[PDB]
Paper text:
In this study, we use unbiased antibody selections to identify functional antibodies capable of either activating or inhibiting [name] activity. Through cryogenic-electron microscopy, we characterized the structures of these antibodies in complex with [name] and revealed insights into their mechanisms of action. Rather than steric occlusion of the substrate-binding catalytic pocket, the antibodies modulate [name] activity through interactions with allosteric binding sites adjacent to the catalytic pocket. Consistent with previous structures of the enzyme alone, [name] forms an anti-parallel head-to-tail homodimer in C2 symmetry. Each [name] monomer adopts an elongated fold with a N-terminal immunoglobulin-like structure and a C-terminal α/β propeller structure, and each monomer binds to a total of five Ca2+ ions in two distinct pockets.Fig. 3 hA362 directly contributes to the [name] dimerization interface and helps order the substrate-binding site.
We determined the cryo-EM structure of [name] in complex with [name] at 3.2 Å resolution to understand the antibody calcium dependency and inhibitory mechanism. Similar to hA362, [name] adopts a homodimeric structure and forms a 2–2 complex with [name], but here each antibody only directly interacts with one [name] monomer (buried surface area 1,122.9 Å2). The CDRH1 and H2 of [name] binds to a region that is structured only upon binding of three Ca2+ ions in the N-terminal domain, explaining why the binding of [name] is Ca2+-dependent. Each [name] monomer in the [name]–[name] complex only contains three of the five Ca2+ ions that are typically bound in [name] structures and the hA362–[name] complex. A closer look of the structure reveals that binding of [name] to [name] leads to the occlusion of both Ca2+ ions in C-terminal domain while the ions in the N-terminal domain remain bound. Additionally, the Y106 residue in CDR H3 loop of [name] interacts with Trp347 in [name] (pink), pulling the 340–352 loop out of the substrate-binding site and disrupting a small helix usually formed in the active structures (residues 374–383). R374 and the nearby helical region are also no longer resolved with [name] binding. Our structure shows that binding of [name] to [name] results in D350 flipping away from the substrate pocket, thus leading to enzyme inhibition. Additionally, [name] forms many hydrophobic interactions with one predominant [name] monomer although loop H3 also interacts with the second [name] monomer. These results reveal another mechanism for blocking [name] activity, namely pulling out loop 340–352 and preventing Ca2+ and substrate from binding.
Numbering used by the authors:
A (entry chain A), D (entry chain D): 4 to 33, 39 to 53, 68 to 97, 100 to 123, 140 to 311, 316 to 339, 347 to 372, 383 to 395, ...
B (entry chain C), E (entry chain F): 4 to 124
C (entry chain B), F (entry chain E): 1 to 106
């Protein structure tokens, strides 16, 4: 902490903070002995040899300055002595540290005040420069400055709270006052105030602060914010202030987390009345809330959440192409940019490395040709800034649309990993039709006419490899085995610019609510009464206990956040 | 352990005053606090509100100038100071926290209603 | 002021009957209404906290919706414990108002 | 790598790359057995159960397509068989991987082509878009594409080299041709070419590439560049190209490294003839080269280096306020911004954590007051981007200038850590003068007159704590003990705006060449013949074997790079 | 192991040609290569230079049109093809790599000079 | 062309004597000259690679410097092995030229 020296020339005084080891230099100053007061504990880590280091600690904070002393006795010559007077103070900057990384790591958590608790506001609570609603303190992190000092302390000292200027645009701090008709919060630190003096009284006092983050982790922000309290010595009013003790805490800003479809749903939003009827029935069977949206939301939006030990809230993430409320967050950033090209896998363990929140998937090209499309880097960097879900890259530029979710989806399962990966498989659809022709049903209509088509086979051969390419990537990135992947029939054709398009209604990109699957209905209800595509899809999934219904197909789903605490991962 | 309790009622003579309080248990007192009274034979009448950590308050028109609402955030306790009480103010007085709305229309309710106090003038 | 109008003032139904209570707003309030159930001698209880937003913990027997300027509370089938006085709240401004209260009798 | 399926409908063909495990699906296709050709190795990881996975590998690359086959025999019913024909190819993208982090880590190294090997150029070799001088290939990293394929291979396939677009402005790649009158390099990848096709012939061929980095690690660049080679299947000329195999290597760009004064010097640059005479003698005694600079350099510059297993070169780092040549680099970025406020400590070990290159030191304020000065963040971020020397922050705003090196310096030592930390100490200077007065020399001139001065004592008390503040920081950040720190006499005064200034010529900020110290001469050659300041400084250092000379004081020093390899640290 | 060796000399009749070579040992052949000849009784005369990986070449005025310099970067070997050799071209021919300058003035030298060859016309 | 002029054509000195060789440039060349030492029957050796830049491995007995348009090579004291013919090079252009060569005799 500080360095104390002694001399016979003048009496020496020092202030020591409880818990901080204070260095005392008795050597190199006019054999010696040390006799500390009963209120002071002194040890050694005497021939005035500089290698002899004396460490001071104090038992308790004092109510008066200069209450304790250490008697220094030097010793042929006349007696030589020095008088050291110590003041005991307790200063501690407290924050929620126990709740770096890991289940045994330490550090504070700070959330972005991105919701809109003020119902009359048109902006986020982080954008207002103020606290107008007491409910908003539920989202903010609590910090307490606890001091116990002599009654006359801070006559010669002052306390200053500050943050680094590089962080001044990322954090705002409020101080909570007292009174009867009000208990106002007040702005301490912010875009115009990197530091502020605290009028802390002497004796015992606790001062309370409310902290908000102003931005998510991103390219320009690793996610750590440090708050420092500085004790300055102003005993000499003719000279600049000096520093004698500092303390600080570090906050980690929680990442935005994407929720996979394997998490139990909480609310469908319906932004096609017969479709809505089936969704109402499906939502009912699944015990989900359904919200019709009569008249303020888009299908382009994605729904994530922020997790903390004190407050958890959902956050909408909105398209690059404002909808917010109390405990309902909103974040923005910035062909393949539409969030239909975003997906997140279930939790996986890959060769010993655990991904408890799964991994973020998106589609891209195989190489940067002049025509190949890409997802804007600003979004890739934003998503990668949240290390907790390690994004991966898939191949989707072969599709006319490019949305990765066009060929793959996940469903729950009762065993093994608890889920299955469903991929489009022209191989299975071909066999399905060819088997029916081989059994004598080639005259069925939506089959032998399309099986004979050479162009269709060549187009599906090209696509076949385009999909298997991702099959291998996912097995490597997610650690999947073939026994965990289900082939869903689906044929493709190439159109203008030779991009892949679905031959018949997509059998994935379905609405999944728990164990109830809102599968798009294929237009083949002519083959032997029961569409062969419907029976094949059902047969593949029925052993899993999942309930398949086909809807003759503008919506979103909010889902339960993870029970795992993201800050406990490495 | 999560509940609101109220006290400070009793019999007062016309023209006098009473100091009602609502203490929180198991609750950090961060939410706005509301008082609602029900005279015998009548329905619910909202009285007043406070936002503790911003000092915004609101009163019903029938009690403006007569009632004052206040709170001690260090004791998680709200206070309603009723002066110049009239016979018309006889009622059972309840206290409740605000409860937030939800998408798409954010209108708000009252929750964890306490036992209320009996105010007789 | 924003006056709540409830109708009817009282109901008469038996156990197993389906009943509805309607309330009319005096202004175009943005679905911001709530429904409370008061047991005799007890504080009011919250059932619905925005139009169609059922409060957590309430049995599925209770539901309601907006219909233009009117709001409706529905009980799919009255149970022996569902007979109470119901109130409708319109928290649309700094001045909160409640309706008159509708009592459901057996 | 790829997925192979079999069927009786049509013969199936596949290309397998040596060393890559190829998946073969014989199940789910019409008990079976497998009989591979003598040139193919097949194993299993049969009842057509999908859980039976067959893996193909090949012994050697082929000179013809379709030379190997795997016989599939299915088996009540007529015999059923499938024919799989395999082509063996060897494709490997080679780079210097053996030379992530650590002494056992792996990865390629890429240097920034920041020197100027072309003597007629006015710009860096990375700025020219070309290779004009063969010497420049000594700095560039070598990459080789080695393929062994059938003679008719690449009739149905093509190879494309590419990098991510986000990295296209950080790396340039050249390809080396052949001939008799020339062996030209040619531009492959660059700011306008994220990908390029390779005209690789069939059979056996090795193609050579020269890679240069275009920028140092910085806020926008973590320091990793990935080069990918993609094998595309174009057998069907009516359809878009498909991808069948990719490989890539990752380069790590070396950090700019600062050299401490404890490294043996190599060259003094002298940008005051009597001063130069002493520097000439000092340089001579130290066996250093001296370069006088008659007439193209500044004292504001700092000299670092780039280290690699193949080429090491010095790099000038130049002030925010161009000097470059063959194997003589030049980098730029962007009160306290002048590189006089930069220093680097000797190698230290701090509580088990090794800093084999020391740590970068710079001065700053204690808290961001409205008047406090700061070092521009762009420089802090640039220096912090080089994790190998973990920068630390010291307190220097109390000085009128702010340069951290005004109060501390390092010297070599023959024992313990091999060095000592020298700090300005008004305590020692006060005692030095007071001891002389006590012995009867108070009438000496530059002493009792200044000892009696109250203002001087108060100014030095303020400064005393300003320096001890850093004493504690350095002991914590560098792990130093008091036995490793030497107190050098030096008094200070406060001037306008109450900033500290030296009372008498600075006793640190000296010119250090090995064991020979070019100490500024104090103006006290009146005290008892031999200046007491000179005798005190000498006495403190003489036990270390260092040779102290005092110069009656526009220069720089280049010093030997570290023998430690920076890429071997964690 | 680090050295240059030269060969291809001997006696040639006036008007003939000789093909001289310089092979590198222990050297990657990345540096520019120079040829310098010394006739008996005379000093050093630089002949020609090549930058292997850029094909830039330079000749002395006395040999322009008669000498051609070339190299095989796959064999680390440089070649000097001398046609229409005259009696005046009798000399001992040496080969050397360039060596770079240094701060402040970057002028360059020649280093690792080989043994040279004897060319008699 | 850039003509090198050396002076003297030959020296005569004994072992232990200090000698200098000077060379005059025909143009303002930017310190770009070098000095070579040729032993009898051997290839030239490099001593100084830019004005005052001593080549690594050369004994400290050898030094030199610029003096306007002239350049000087100095040997602080001739040793029995220092007697050889010295050359001066001016690599200032695409056309390299050497001086005449100066022989130092015992
Ligand atoms: Ca706010
Ligand atoms: Ca908020
Ligand atoms: Ca909130
Ligand atoms: Ca270049
Ligand atoms: Ca270069
Ligand atoms: Ca170079």
């Amino acid at each position: 902490g500080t360095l104390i020296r002694v001399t016979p020339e003048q009496p020496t005084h020092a202030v020591c903070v409880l818990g901080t080891l204070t260095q005392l230099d008795i050597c190199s100053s006019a054999s010696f002995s040390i006799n500390a007061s009963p209120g002071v504990v002194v040890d050694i880590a005497w021939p005035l040899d500089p290698g002899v280091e004396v460490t001071l600690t104090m038992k308790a904070a004092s109510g008066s300055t200069g209450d304790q002393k250490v008697q220094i006795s030097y010793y042929k010559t006349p007696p030589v002595k020095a008088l050291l007077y110590l003041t005991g103070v307790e200063i501690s900057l407290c924050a929620d540290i126990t709740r770096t990384w890991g289940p045994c790591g330490q550090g504070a958590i700070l959330l972005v005040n991105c919701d809109r608790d003020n119902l009359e506001s048109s902006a986020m609570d982080c954008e207002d420069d103020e606290v107008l609603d007491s409910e908003d303190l539920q989202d903010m992190s609590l910090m307490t400055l606890s001091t116990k000092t002599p009654k006359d302390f801070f006559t010669n000292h002052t306390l200053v709270l500050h943050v680094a200027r590089s962080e001044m645009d990322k954090v705002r701090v409020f101080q909570a006052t007292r009174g009867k008709l009000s208990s106002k919060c007040s702005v301490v630190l912010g875009p115009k105030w990197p530091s502020h003096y605290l009028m802390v009284p002497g004796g015992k006092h606790n001062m309370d602060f409310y902290v908000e983050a102003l931005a998510f982790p991103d390219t320009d922000f690793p996610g750590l914010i440090t708050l420092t309290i500085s004790l300055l010595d102003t005993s000499n009013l003719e000279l600049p202030e000096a520093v004698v003790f500092q303390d600080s805490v570090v906050f980690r800003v929680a990442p935005w987390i994407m929720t996979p479809n394997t998490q139990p749903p909480q609310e469908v939003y319906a932004c096609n009345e017969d479709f809505l009827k089936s969704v109402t029935t499906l939502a009912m069977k699944a015990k989900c809330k359904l919200t019709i949206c009569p008249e303020w939301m888009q299908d382009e939006m994605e729904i994530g959440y922020i997790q903390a030990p004190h407050k958890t809230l959902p956050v909408v993430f909105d398209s690059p192409r404002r909808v917010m409320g109390p405990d309902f967050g909103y974040v923005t950033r910035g062909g393949l940019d539409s969030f239909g090209n975003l997906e997140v896998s279930p939790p996986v363990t890959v060769r010993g490395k655990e991904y408890p929140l799964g991994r973020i998937l998106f589609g891209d090209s195989c190489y940067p040709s002049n025509d190949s499309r890409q997802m804007h880097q600003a979004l890739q960097d934003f998503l990668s800034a949240q290390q907790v879900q390690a994004p991966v890259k898939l191949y989707s530029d072969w599709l006319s649309v490019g949305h990765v979710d066009e060929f793959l989806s996940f469903v729950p399962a009762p065993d093994r990993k608890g889920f299955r990966l469903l991929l489009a498989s022209p191989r299975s659809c071909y066999k399905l039709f060819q088997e029916q022709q081989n059994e004598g049903h080639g005259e069925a209509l939506l089959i032998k006419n399309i099986l004979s088509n050479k162009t269709l086979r060549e187009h599906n051969s090209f696509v076949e490899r385009c999909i298997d390419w991702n099959r291998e990537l996912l097995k490597r990135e997610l650690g999947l085995a073939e026994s965990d992947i289900i082939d869903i029939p689906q044929l493709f054709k190439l159109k203008e610019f030779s991009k892949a398009e679905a031959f018949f209604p997509n059998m994935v990109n379905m609405l999944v609510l728990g164990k109830h699957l809102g599968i798009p209905k294929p237009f083949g209800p002519v083959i032997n009464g029961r569409c062969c595509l419907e029976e094949k899809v059902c047969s593949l999934l029925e052993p899993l206990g999942l309930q398949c219904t086909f809807i003759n197909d503008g919506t979103n789903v909010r889902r339960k956040p993870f029970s795992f605490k993201w800050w406990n991962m490495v | 352990e999560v509940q609101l309790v109220e006290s400070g009622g009793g019999l007062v003579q016309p023209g006098g005053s009473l100091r009602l309080s609502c203490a929180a248990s198991g609750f950090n007192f961060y939410y706005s606090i509301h008082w609602v009274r029900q005279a015998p034979g009548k329905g619910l009448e909202w009285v007043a509100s406070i936002s503790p950590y911003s000092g915004y308050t609101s009163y019903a028109d029938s009690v403006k100038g007569r009632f004052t609402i206040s709170a001690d955030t260090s004791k998680n306790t709200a206070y309603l100071q009723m002066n110049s009480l009239r016979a018309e103010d006889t009622a059972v007085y309840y206290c409740a926290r605000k409860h937030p709305g939800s998408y798409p229309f954010w209108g708000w309710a009252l929750d964890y209603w306490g036992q209320g106090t009996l105010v007789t003038v | 002021d924003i006056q709540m109008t409830q109708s009817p003032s009282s109901l008469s139904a038996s156990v197993g009957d389906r009943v509805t209570i309607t309330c009319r707003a005096s202004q175009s309030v943005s679905s911001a209404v709530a429904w409370y159930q008061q047991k005799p001698g007890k504080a009011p209880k919250l059932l619905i906290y925005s139009a169609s937003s059922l409060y957590s913990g309430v049995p599925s027997r209770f539901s309601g919706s907006r219909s233009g300027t009117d709001f409706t509370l529905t009980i799919s089938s009255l149970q022996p414990e569902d007979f109470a006085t119901y109130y409708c709240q319109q928290s649309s401004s700094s001045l909160v108002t409640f309706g008159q209260g509708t009592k459901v009798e057996i």
